[PDB]
Enzyme design. Structure first.
Site, mmCIF file in Angstrom:
data_model
loop_
_atom_site.group_PDB
_atom_site.id
_atom_site.type_symbol
_atom_site.label_atom_id
_atom_site.label_comp_id
_atom_site.label_asym_id
_atom_site.label_seq_id
_atom_site.Cartn_x
_atom_site.Cartn_y
_atom_site.Cartn_z
ATOM 1 N N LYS A 150 0.827 -1.190 0.000
ATOM 2 C CA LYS A 150 0.000 0.000 0.000
ATOM 3 C C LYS A 150 0.867 1.248 0.000
ATOM 4 O O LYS A 150 0.547 2.214 -0.670
ATOM 5 C CB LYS A 150 -0.953 -0.027 1.194
ATOM 6 C CG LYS A 150 -2.092 0.977 1.129
ATOM 7 C CD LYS A 150 -3.281 0.456 1.922
ATOM 8 C CE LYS A 150 -4.400 1.456 1.963
ATOM 9 N NZ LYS A 150 -3.910 2.678 2.639
ATOM 10 N N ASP A 151 1.977 1.243 0.720
ATOM 11 C CA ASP A 151 2.818 2.421 0.691
ATOM 12 C C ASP A 151 3.489 2.530 -0.658
ATOM 13 O O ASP A 151 3.419 3.568 -1.295
ATOM 14 C CB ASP A 151 3.866 2.365 1.780
ATOM 15 C CG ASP A 151 3.263 2.453 3.146
ATOM 16 O OD1 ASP A 151 2.023 2.526 3.251
ATOM 17 O OD2 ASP A 151 4.026 2.451 4.122
HETATM 18 C C1 LIG Z 1 16.619 1.634 7.492
HETATM 19 C C2 LIG Z 1 15.117 1.959 7.234
HETATM 20 C C3 LIG Z 1 14.196 1.851 8.540
HETATM 21 C C4 LIG Z 1 12.680 2.194 8.176
HETATM 22 C C5 LIG Z 1 12.312 3.623 8.678
HETATM 23 C C6 LIG Z 1 10.849 4.249 8.418
HETATM 24 C C7 LIG Z 1 9.785 3.259 8.952
HETATM 25 O O1 LIG Z 1 9.018 3.882 10.096
HETATM 26 O O2 LIG Z 1 8.787 3.004 7.808
HETATM 27 C C8 LIG Z 1 7.330 3.354 7.929
HETATM 28 C C9 LIG Z 1 6.977 2.422 8.922
HETATM 29 C C10 LIG Z 1 6.826 4.751 8.346
HETATM 30 N N1 LIG Z 1 5.405 4.630 8.233
HETATM 31 C C11 LIG Z 1 4.760 3.590 8.752
HETATM 32 O O3 LIG Z 1 5.341 2.634 9.397
HETATM 33 C C12 LIG Z 1 3.274 3.459 8.585
HETATM 34 C C13 LIG Z 1 2.449 3.342 9.737
HETATM 35 C C14 LIG Z 1 1.004 3.189 9.584
HETATM 36 C C15 LIG Z 1 0.395 3.155 8.292
HETATM 37 C C16 LIG Z 1 1.224 3.279 7.143
HETATM 38 N N2 LIG Z 1 0.680 3.249 5.856
HETATM 39 C C17 LIG Z 1 -0.436 3.795 5.548
HETATM 40 O O4 LIG Z 1 -1.216 3.161 4.915
HETATM 41 C C18 LIG Z 1 2.623 3.429 7.271
HETATM 42 O O5 LIG Z 1 3.319 3.533 6.130
HETATM 43 C C19 LIG Z 1 7.344 5.863 7.425
HETATM 44 O O6 LIG Z 1 6.739 7.136 7.835
HETATM 45 O O7 LIG Z 1 8.815 6.011 7.507
HETATM 46 C C20 LIG Z 1 9.308 6.283 8.841
HETATM 47 C C21 LIG Z 1 9.142 7.522 9.285
HETATM 48 C C22 LIG Z 1 10.771 5.705 9.057
HETATM 49 O O8 LIG Z 1 11.828 6.414 8.350
HETATM 50 C C23 LIG Z 1 12.081 7.740 8.670
HETATM 51 O O9 LIG Z 1 12.435 7.771 10.004
HETATM 52 C C24 LIG Z 1 13.231 8.171 7.785
HETATM 53 C C25 LIG Z 1 13.618 9.673 8.017
HETATM 54 C C26 LIG Z 1 14.101 9.843 9.322
HETATM 55 C C27 LIG Z 1 14.760 10.004 7.076
#
Ligand SMILES: CCCCC[C@H]1C(=O)O[C@@H](C)[C@H](NC(=O)c2cccc(NC=O)c2O)C(=O)O[C@H](C)[C@@H]1OC(=O)CC(C)C
Ligand code: HEM
Ligand code: HEM
Ligand code: HEM
Ligand code: HEM
Ligand SMILES: CCCCC[C@H]1C(=O)O[C@@H](C)[C@H](NC(=O)c2cccc(NC=O)c2O)C(=O)O[C@H](C)[C@@H]1OC(=O)CC(C)C
Lengths: 78, 49, 98, 100, 66, 241, 379, 59, 108
Positions: G227-228
């Site tokens: 989905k993402d």
């Molecule tokens: C080495 C890689 C580790 C993975 C890091 C990465 C990880 O949290 O990846 C997802 C889970 C995160 N969103 C979600 O989990 C998520 C939660 C509920 C629903 C949905 N979808 C909707 O339908 C989601 O998509 C998304 O927002 O990215 C974040 C925030 C983070 O990454 C960020 O810090 C990166 C920034 C700091 C540069």
């Protein structure tokens, strides 16, 4: 919170089929499209109104402005 | 009880027209997967590009 | 210890030990005929020098000074009423008045 | 002139949370009080509520709803938790007052 | 050598709107140059014209240009 | 009066999200800049270098840049000295500095036309109009000594005299060098000038659009394929009684 | 553990935030916004890091440098385009993400929400700088107000500014010291974002119905990962479309003219993703008031959690506040228009008006229509 | 029967699958470009330098 | 948890890496190297971040810029000095830290 410690769930039989044994496509034109409208028509009367209202306030606002710019043929009839 | 339980009808409701009893689900889908996979295989492809 | 290190690494920015004083500029008043305003490059920010008209000078006096945000009669802000000079820097947030 | 009764009926069908087929109480956000409330629920009604919620979720997750038939009717909505929840609250308000 | 512009502004200067405008202007012009003391300016009226003229000037001008 | 006239839209040969620039036209656009604007209008961000492969030929541009002498580095005795403009030089500045130019153009500052097209709302449409569009101020309106009325310009009084009339030059390709015509060519140039990427950028856009087209559905299937497990699914509450 | 996907200190995190993470089954696109916000954070950090490879922070070279970075560096132009636009796709997603959260009371996860604000703020902050960098007419004059904007704070103000930026007037120093902040800040957003998700995970993801989801909850991976990836390509196509077809579509052209410390452009329209608060600021004639208004214009999000009265979480069953909501979303789209509009009677008033409904709709209407709807249920 | 032939031979073994993504991408690239390039250029006949390169190289 | 120092997602980390962390009783200075290494990482990041506030990355201005950053910016000179040296205190500690680790098989 992880899995296995979420809720005390009793008596819920669920049946689902492998994606390969079913069709993802789905049933558009049957249940598909119908529900789409079932919704456009459900919230249209709850979302559109304000947007519509803005529009007006936008046009009105703009025209009037564009008007207050044009000269009153009678700011000097003499 | 539990004998009184059934898997409801998913036939047309879902199911690809290669699956409506009286004939091996096998031999059939081992073709279907190709497709769904075909896509993915492609998306992966498209992505690479 | 800290108090200082802070103060220190806080002035390690404010100012810059580089200050000028072009506070002196020469202007040919004839470059600015009656009714218009000339802008000059002066001390990091614009400078306004204007030749005011009879009417201009007249209405600037007829101003309701008591009802002013910054009460000041025109005559206590300029020496030769036919000549008004200002720092072309708005007081709000720093833009150049047009 | 205008019945609050007549009104509630409005809001009820207006909220349309019964289109998913779940009682009012099946919706109230779950705060400290409610949790304790629901935790006092007879196992009957609990599993009932659960399913109703899971069904609700399952629907919602499918974007589709419940046949006009299965919607629950205003008058037939069962305030299964309001009673417990209330004791709770006053139980608390009783305690909160005593600790002063 | 003739500028397709001027030719196309000729045609355009004839479209109903131009005329209903060119007129509106012509009046104002000689309505202001007829008096000694008046603040009126026939700019607005001038635009309305232009606005309309050039508008089709565009719908066609680039056809004759290489 | 904050009263202004907004420039009409011309169907430029390169307006289309998928239509490149008429490179032929730019070539002329260049010449018109070189032969008539590059005597008041500086254009610091381009250089003959570019022209090569886009509207001119290597040898063409090289000899094209020879056409100007440029002040260059210190002697051994250290002294600026002029020398034939190489290929890598940037289009010549007409004035040593702005205030110098301002003293050459009746007190006005002919703005550099590198990013002109995108520095003024309307781009070519504006610019074109501006050029092909001077005229007598309507009545009651009087432009002062040295300026020239042009309705499309804010203030309607410009410090630039109509710099383009019929024949002012002669496009060596055999093109009716009419005002409208030349003025067109100048604008198509001013565009590329402002963003050489244009074509490369749209072509790209093309492909980018064919990937979305192709990729998004693919992953959509995949998204549905995967969710069907749930979309399909069915509940049921079976307590014992 | 034979698992490994759970027995490895690092590796677990992943198979605990991308795989195995329990997420509500029912979740609308409005939940992608965030995963997108990330991709922006990335696209921004990646492109900008790369654009900094060519920037030259210094008045006399600053403007040009960028131009060079475009015209001279292979695809450098593409990089820029992408960057300036990511800025927007970034603010768009953020603006939507906040929406969603507002109308599902995700603001009930308080901390996860409060952190969120910070992010916004910072994203607004970092985007302020950076735009100064190219040092265009806008860049400059934005620097001069926004900064000078802290003039209002008495005593510590005039001083805080003549420090905020370099010496005593937006000049070279201010520029170099901004680049630094910009180069730095994004990495803060990244950090906080981590802190943001941390707080989240403490409390599962919300869900559109606003009622427990333990009853369902599907493994983040199989599902939402895809989905993402999908939503990635979806709200990727527009952003790219812009960047390849009409880049400056959102970008004011006025900024294409190198800065002039002497003339602020007649018609200074701030960046779109800023207009709303902008409007609010000018429609409250008083330096301080102007600023104050603004201050709260955004710094109000912090109160939404306390201005929640509905016995239900989300408001999908609150048709009343529901339209009040869009009255807000539109009241915002309005302020915006009124922001991109010069100050005359046709506007102005409209302005301060919406710039009044805004507050009220939040501070008062909502909580009122809130309790009210509860009583229309005997609560 | 393509799809079946495909799955069994190409998509079954995760080892193979990948291998066709690669060899496939190579093919998709080469083909997508030529196609794109053509579509593009054609939509701009006589406007590209490739197209005027000749008034100093004929056409 | 009435604790808080353990019931707060963030707050725990701290009261779990600076407080409550089980560390061997017997530990020589050779164990500080690391906590120091941090302080360097900081002193470096702090000073350098601050020194970048005045740097001007570009041949013709690069050298001078720094000089300016010293002579012109209040304590800018101190900042630089500190920075270039943190570099060393940094390598020193690192070089020692590696030592220690090598001769206690911390490399295990
Ligand atoms: C080495 C890689 C580790 C993975 C890091 C990465 C990880 O949290 O990846 C997802 C889970 C995160 N969103 C979600 O989990 C998520 C939660 C509920 C629903 C949905 N979808 C909707 O339908 C989601 O998509 C998304 O927002 O990215 C974040 C925030 C983070 O990454 C960020 O810090 C990166 C920034 C700091 C540069
Ligand atoms: C050559 C074809 C040419 C073009 C093209 C052209 C355009 C142009 C633009 C777009 C502007 C003004 C935009 C604005 O709103 O400020 C501009 C401005 C000036 N120009 Fe020009 N110009 C062309 C050629 C020439 C030539 C040969 C001269 C010098 C004789 C000249 C001069 C100027 C001046 C002066 C301005 C100032 C405008 C003002 O501030 O009032 N241009 N030009
Ligand atoms: C958090 C996301 C970011 C935001 C909100 C952002 C936004 C911006 C904006 C809007 C500008 C002005 C662009 C323009 O002229 O239109 C900018 C410029 C710039 N940004 Fe960022 N930026 C971000 C992150 C980065 C990063 C991580 C770096 C590198 C550390 C960076 C380096 C630059 C550079 C080189 C410029 C100058 C050239 C230019 O103006 O395009 N940016 N950034
Ligand atoms: C820094 C950029 C941000 C990123 C990358 C980010 C990321 C996330 C992600 C991915 C989630 C998971 C669920 C979802 O996608 O909605 C989330 C949830 C949330 N974020 Fe953000 N967020 C950011 C900014 C914000 C902002 C500015 C707010 C402030 C209003 C905010 C408020 C929330 C809320 C309320 C939730 C929890 C409730 C829910 O998910 O339903 N976030 N955020
Ligand atoms: C990891 C620790 C760091 C190391 C190992 C380090 C080391 C150095 C070194 C040795 C130099 C040359 C200094 C000299 O001329 O003697 C230097 C210069 C510089 N560093 Fe760092 N640096 C570090 C972190 C930083 C940080 C975080 C920044 C900012 C992001 C920074 C910005 C600069 C600046 C402005 C200069 C140029 C001026 C100067 O030469 O002193 N440094 N750094
Ligand atoms: C908000 C602040 C959170 C605290 C972060 C901070 C935290 O780990 O602080 C200590 C525990 C860490 N060293 C030790 O624990 C430690 C362990 C065994 C023995 C000794 N002493 C010897 O006798 C120690 O000192 C020390 O090396 O700093 C690190 C590494 C970290 O900080 C670094 O990421 C900061 C970098 C990333 C900028």
């Amino acid at each position: 919170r992880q899995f296995g410690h979420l809720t005390r769930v009793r008596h819920l039989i669920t049946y689902s089929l492998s994606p390969f044994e079913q069709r993802p496509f789905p049933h558009y034109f049957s249940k598909g499209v119908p529900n789409v409208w079932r919704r456009l028509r459900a919230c249209i009367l709850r979302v559109a109104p304000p947007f519509l209202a803005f529009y007006l306030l936008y046009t009105w606002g703009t025209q009037e402005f564009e008007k207050s710019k044009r000269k009153n043929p009678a700011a000097y009839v003499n | 009880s539990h004998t009184d339980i059934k898997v409801p009808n998913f036939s047309d409701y879902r199911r690809p027209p290669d699956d409506y009893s009286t004939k091996s689900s096998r031999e059939s889908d081992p073709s279907r997967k190709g497709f769904s996979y075909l896509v993915t295989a492609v998306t992966t492809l498209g992505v690479a590009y | 210890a800290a108090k200082n290190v802070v103060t220190q690494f806080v002035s390690s920015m404010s100012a810059s030990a580089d200050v000028l004083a072009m506070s002196k500029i020469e202007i040919k008043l004839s470059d600015i005929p009656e009714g218009k305003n000339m802008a000059f490059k002066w001390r990091g920010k614009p400078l306004f020098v204007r030749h005011r008209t009879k009417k201009e000078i007249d209405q600037e006096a007829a101003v309701e000074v008591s009802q002013l945000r910054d009460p000041q009669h025109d005559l206590e802000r300029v020496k030769k009423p036919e000549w008004v000079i200002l720092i072309g820097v708005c007081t709000h947030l720093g833009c150049v008045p047009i | 002139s205008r019945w609050l009764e007549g009104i509630r009926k409005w809001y009820y069908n207006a909220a349309g949370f019964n289109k998913y087929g779940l009682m009012r109480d099946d919706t109230i956000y779950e705060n400290d009080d409610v949790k304790e409330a629901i935790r006092r629920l007879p196992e009957n009604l609990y599993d009932d509520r659960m399913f109703r919620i899971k069904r609700a979720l399952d629907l919602n997750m499918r974007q589709q709803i419940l046949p006009k038939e299965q919607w629950t009717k205003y008058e037939e909505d069962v305030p299964y938790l309001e009673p417990y929840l209330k004791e709770v609250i006053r139980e608390r308000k009783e305690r909160e007052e005593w600790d002063k | 050598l003739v500028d397709p512009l001027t030719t196309v502004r000729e045609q355009c200067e004839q479209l109903e709107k131009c005329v209903k405008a060119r007129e509106r202007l012509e009046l104002c012009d000689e309505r202001v140059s007829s008096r000694s003391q008046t603040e009126e300016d026939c700019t607005e009226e001038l635009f309305d014209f232009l606005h309309a003229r050039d508008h089709c000037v565009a719908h066609k001008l680039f056809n004759s240009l290489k | 009066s904050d009263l202004e006239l907004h420039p009409p839209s011309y169907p430029w040969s390169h307006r289309g999200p998928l239509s490149s620039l008429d490179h032929t036209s730019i070539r002329r656009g260049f010449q018109v800049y070189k032969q008539v604007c590059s005597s008041c209008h500086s254009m610091d961000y381009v250089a003959y270098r570019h022209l090569v492969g886009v509207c001119y030929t290597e040898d063409e541009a090289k000899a094209l840049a020879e056409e100007v002498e440029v002040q260059d580095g210190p002697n051994e005795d250290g002294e600026m000295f002029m020398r034939p403009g190489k290929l890598s030089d940037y289009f010549p500045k007409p004035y040593p500095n702005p205030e110098a130019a301002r003293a050459a153009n009746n007190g006005a500052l002919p703005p550099d036309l590198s990013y002109i097209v995108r520095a003024r709302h309307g781009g070519e449409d504006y610019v074109f109009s501006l050029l092909t569009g001077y005229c007598e101020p309507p009545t009651g309106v009087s432009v002062r000594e040295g300026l020239y009325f042009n309705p499309y310009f804010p203030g309607q009084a410009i410090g630039m005299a109509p710099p383009i009339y019929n024949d002012v030059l002669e496009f060596d390709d055999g093109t009716p060098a009419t005002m409208s015509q030349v003025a067109k060519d100048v604008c198509t140039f001013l565009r590329w000038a402002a963003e050489p990427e244009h074509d490369h950028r749209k072509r790209m856009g093309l492909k980018m659009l064919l990937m979305m087209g192709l990729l998004v559905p693919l992953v959509y299937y995949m998204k549905r394929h995967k969710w069907s497990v749930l979309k399909s699914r069915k509940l049921a509450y079976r307590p014992p009684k | 553990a034979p698992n490994i996907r759970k027995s490895h200190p690092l590796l677990k995190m992943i198979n605990n935030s991308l795989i195995d993470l329990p997420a509500p089954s029912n979740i609308s696109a409005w939940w992608n916004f965030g995963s997108l916000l990330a991709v922006c954070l990335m696209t921004q950090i990646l492109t900008g890091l790369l654009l900094a490879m060519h920037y030259t922070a210094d008045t006399s070279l600053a403007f040009s440098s960028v131009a060079h970075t475009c015209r001279n560096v292979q695809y450098g132009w593409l990089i820029r385009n992408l960057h300036a636009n990511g800025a927007s796709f970034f603010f768009i997603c953020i603006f939507l993400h906040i929406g969603r959260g507002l109308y599902y009371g995700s603001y009930l996860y308080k901390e996860t929400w409060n952190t969120g604000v910070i992010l916004l703020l910072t994203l607004m902050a970092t985007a302020f700088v950076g735009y100064v960098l190219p040092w265009g007419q806008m860049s400059f004059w934005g620097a001069t107000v926004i900064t000078n904007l802290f003039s209002a704070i008495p005593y510590i103000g005039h001083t805080l500014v003549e420090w905020a930026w370099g010496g005593f007037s937006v000049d070279n120093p201010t520029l170099t010291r901004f680049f630094a902040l910009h180069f730095l800040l994004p990495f803060a957003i990244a950090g906080i974002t981590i802190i943001h998700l941390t707080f989240l995970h403490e409390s599962g993801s919300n869900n559109p119905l606003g009622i427990s989801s333990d009853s369902d909850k599907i493994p983040f991976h199989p599902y939402y990962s895809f989905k993402d990836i999908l939503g990635l390509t979806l709200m990727l196509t527009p952003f790219l479309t812009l960047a390849l077809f009409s880049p400056n579509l959102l970008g004011d052209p006025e900024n294409f003219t190198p800065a002039n410390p002497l003339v602020t452009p007649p018609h200074i329209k701030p960046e779109w993703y800023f207009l709303f608060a902008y409007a609010i600021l000018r429609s409250i004639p008083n330096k301080l008031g102007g600023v104050l208004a603004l201050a709260a214009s955004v710094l109000i999000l912090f109160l939404i959690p306390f201005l929640h009265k509905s016995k239900q979480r989300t408001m999908t069953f609150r048709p009343l506040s529901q339209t009040l909501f869009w009255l807000l979303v539109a009241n915002l789209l309005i302020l915006t228009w009124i922001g991109s509009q010069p100050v005359e009677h046709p506007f102005i008033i409209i302005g301060q008006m919406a710039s009044l409904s805004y507050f009220t709709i939040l501070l008062i209407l909502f909580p009122t229509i809130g309790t009210l709807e509860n009583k229309m249920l005997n609560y | 029967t393509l799809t079946a032939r495909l799955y069994s031979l190409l998509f079954r073994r995760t080892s193979t699958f990948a291998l066709t993504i690669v060899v496939g991408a190579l093919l998709f690239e080469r083909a997508f470009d030529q196609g794109a390039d053509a579509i593009y250029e054609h939509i701009n006949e006589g406007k590209l330098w490739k197209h005027i390169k000749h008034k100093y190289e004929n056409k």
